[PDB]
Design a protein around this ligand. Structure first.
Ligand SMILES: O=C(O)[C@@H]1CS[C@H]([C@H]2C[C@@H]3CCSCN3N2)[C@@H](CO)CN1
Length: 265
């Protein structure tokens, strides 16, 4: 029984675990705390990039964005190295997804524009995909400071799964923008010990991770079986029982993904 395995893992890592895999083909939906709210953490960066792709011509990717010291306010492995020359929208999308670059995320939010520094339009983008649940209320690094239970800056494994399904497998984006998003998530550098670690090597995996205080660790992915059958896999977790300093545990998400992969094989 799968719900039993997920419960075992919660006890092992002193964690709250949320899992959703949408129903597809002759495969039933997998769901565990799938409608409870979990912090986005950095996972929002993937649909952010979709929002910015949708809103503009693909030529927009080549627009150069300049920024400086007081824009670097969060973990920003790529933006910190290019601050003197600036970065193109394209480079920023690349960094936001592949290195979870926070400054890139803020600059892309600003590019979207409108109230809340972009966060309202980010949310409106999800609403356009039929996601009535998720909300982004702040940008980096403030979006990470909400305590356990706080509804600000949250999604649900169910909500973000259906969003990612439309973005990557569905027609939320035209093919050329869709490929750009898909390719960036394929080339993700941060996700090796999470959902990717639970699936056999001959499965293709693309993903965006999230991490936070209170032991938050997320991963949202699309996986393809060796015969090309795709599944969307959303895994979210926290370990709020250990307080603000509780360490995120990637192994939890890797074990949860192993349980899911065995069921989808
Ligand atoms: O800039 C920040 O302070 C935040 C902290 S939480 C989390 C951090 C936390 C994790 C630790 C090491 S590197 C990647 N970092 N990503 C990110 C997304 O999951 C968001 N960036």
């Amino acid at each position: 029984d799968l719900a039993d395995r997920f419960a075992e893992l919660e006890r092992r890592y002193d964690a709250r675990l949320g899992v959703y895999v949408p129903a597809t083909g002759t495969t039933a939906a997998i769901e565990y705390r799938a409608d409870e709210r979990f912090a986005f953490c950095s996972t929002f960066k993937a649909p952010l990039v979709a929002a910015v792709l949708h809103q503009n011509p693909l030529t927009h990717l080549d627009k150069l964005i300049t920024y400086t010291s007081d824009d670097i306010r969060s973990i920003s492995p790529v933006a910190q190295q290019h601050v003197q020359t600036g970065m193109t929208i394209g480079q920023l999308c690349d960094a936001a997804i592949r290195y979870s670059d926070g400054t890139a995320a803020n600059l892309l939010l600003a590019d979207l524009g409108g109230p809340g520094g972009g966060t309202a339009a980010f949310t409106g983008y999800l609403r356009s995909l039929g996601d009535t649940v998720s909300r982004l209320d702040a940008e980096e690094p403030e979006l990470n400071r909400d305590p356990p239970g706080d509804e600000r800056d949250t999604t649900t494994p169910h909500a973000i799964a259906l969003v990612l399904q439309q973005l990557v497998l569905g027609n939320a984006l035209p093919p050329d923008k869709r490929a750009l998003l898909t390719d960036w998530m394929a080339r993700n550098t941060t996700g090796a010990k999470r959902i990717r670690a639970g699936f056999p090597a001959d499965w293709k995996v693309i993903d965006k991770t999230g991490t936070g205080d209170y032991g938050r660790a997320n991963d949202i992915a699309v996986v393809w079986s060796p015969t090309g059958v795709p599944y969307v896999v959303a895994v979210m977790s926290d370990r709020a029982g250990g307080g603000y300093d509780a360490e995120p545990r990637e192994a939890l998400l890797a074990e949860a993904a192993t349980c899911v992969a065995g069921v989808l094989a």
